[PDB]
Write a protein that binds this ligand. Structure first.
Ligand code: CL
Length: 129
């Protein structure tokens, strides 16, 4: 799925991300916008040889097992390709683990560089939550 902005905000809220570990919903919507352009199927290779998967661009180096990575840490205990569905449950569940481990959202590079410190509430304006 390519989500609309408020559509994704509502889905993320149903999946418990509103204020999860202290991060308001706008943070999560901004992250998805700049990580994946609201796209559940997006994947992106990185310069370190890893790949980011799905709506929240979960990275294969630490978080999911891509089936190649020798000695994969797989901290979310999930195949990376299993993050590529229109249903956001698995990506949300892994995001919850990431933000808990990091005491923050800094692992999301796009969030850290394009969302952090901005008026993230603008991302949920008009969504009637
Ligand atoms: Cl929705």
């Amino acid at each position: 799925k390519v989500f609309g902005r408020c559509e994704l905000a509502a889905a993320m809220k149903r999946h418990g991300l509103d204020n999860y570990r202290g991060y308001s919903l706008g943070n999560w919507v901004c992250a998805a916008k700049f990580e994946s352009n609201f796209n559940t199927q997006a994947t992106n290779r990185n310069t370190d040889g890893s790949t980011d998967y799905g709506i929240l661009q979960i990275n294969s180096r630490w978080w999911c097992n891509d089936g190649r990575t020798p000695g994969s840490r797989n901290l979310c205990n999930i195949p990376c390709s299993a993050l590529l569905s229109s249903d956001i449950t698995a990506s949300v569940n892994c995001a919850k683990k990431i933000v808990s481990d990091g005491n923050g959202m800094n692992a999301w590079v796009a969030w850290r560089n394009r969302c952090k410190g901005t008026d993230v509430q603008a991302w949920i304006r008009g969504c009637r939550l």
